[PDB]
Structure formats: structure tokens, C-alpha cells
Structure 1
Amino acid sequence: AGNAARDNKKTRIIPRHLQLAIRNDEELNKLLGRVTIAQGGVLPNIQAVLLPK
């Protein structure tokens, strides 16, 4: 989360950085799964094929 904050041009850890920590690593992502993060949002995903040619 602190690396996600520092990479995304910030320093104060907030729920978005926790969602970025959880969803970039498959073993956090399977451990938490269907649980939800207050104002963490969803990990960036403009879907393939819908991304224009």
C-alpha cells in the first residue's frame, strides 16, 4: 500500500492504496475475495475488446 501510494504520486495511505495492495497480488485477492473496502473503489480495468481498435 505504501509503495502504491508513493508510485501514484502521493504519501498518505488511504483506502484506494489498500485496494491497490489487495488486487495486484493474487494471494491477497483470493484471501479477501468478496469482502469490500470502504471508498477503495475498483482496480483500474477498461476492458479488452471494448478498448477500441
Structure 2
Amino acid sequence: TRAKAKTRSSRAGLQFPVGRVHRLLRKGNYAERVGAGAPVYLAAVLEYLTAEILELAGNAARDNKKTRIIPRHLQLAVRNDEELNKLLGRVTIAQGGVLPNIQSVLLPKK
């Protein structure tokens, strides 16, 4: 009898689908062959980035007295983190708005 099925995500201690990433790499016309550890590494990287953005968005939501993350929270999280802003510099988030930035020259004179 064959052994009980165990997902590759559980082996690496990851929540993202390692098998789905492997299938997308194989069927994405990227290379003739795909290594075994490559989908694991890519799933780990994607999970880390998602965790960072979700943590920052949850912090923003808690600061806005909300319990559900909305696009505004994601936009605030992305544009407030320097590295995340650099990564998504040319990315537009729908319904995210803009930061409250008013130039100091336009402020009233005391």
C-alpha cells in the first residue's frame, strides 16, 4: 500500500501551495526543466512578502479602528514602508487613495 499523501507545503512548513507553484513554473514557459527546491523557495518568498504586507495592513486597520483590511489599508501599508514602496513603485492600488501630504510652503503662516 502507498504511503499517506502529504502536501509539499507541509514538508517545508509553508502555507502557500508548493505544488501549484511547481505546476505554474512547469507550464509557464520559463525553462525546459524546473528543480525540486525552486518551488519551495518561491513559495517561501511569496509567503514572506504576503506576511509582511498583511501585517502592515492589519496594523493600519487597527490604527483606523477597523477589523477588516480594505484597499486603503493596503495602500497605506505599501506607501509607508520604504522597501515595499520601492518594490511597488510603478503599481497602482485601486481605491487606495493617496497619503495625506501637504507641502509646507502651502500651509498658512502660523
Counterparts of 1:47 and 1:29 in 2: how far apart (Å)? 20
Please report the RMSD computed on the Cα atoms of aligned residues, expressed in angstroms. 0.9
Counterparts of 2:102 and 2:64 in 1: how far apart (Å)? 18
Q: Which runs of 5+ in 2 are unaligned?
A: 1-56
Q: Which has the larger radius of gyration?
A: 2
**Post-superposition shift, 1:46?**
1.7
Give the TM-score normalised by structure 1. Answer: 0.89
Counterparts of 1:23 and 1:8 in 2: how far apart (Å)? 16
Matched positions, count = 53
Counterparts of 1:24 and 1:13 in 2: how far apart (Å)? 16
Q: Which runs of 5+ in 1 are unaligned?
A: none
**4+ long deviations beyond 2 Å:** none
- Which moves more between the two structures, 21-30 or 40-49? 40-49
Counterparts of 1:11 and 1:49 in 2: how far apart (Å)? 37
The alignment-based identity, stated in percent, is 96
**Higher normalized strand content (fraction of residues):** 2
Match of 2:83 in 1: 27
1:1-53 per-residue CA deviation (whole Å, 9 max, x = no partner) reads 00000011211100000001001111001000021001001111122111113
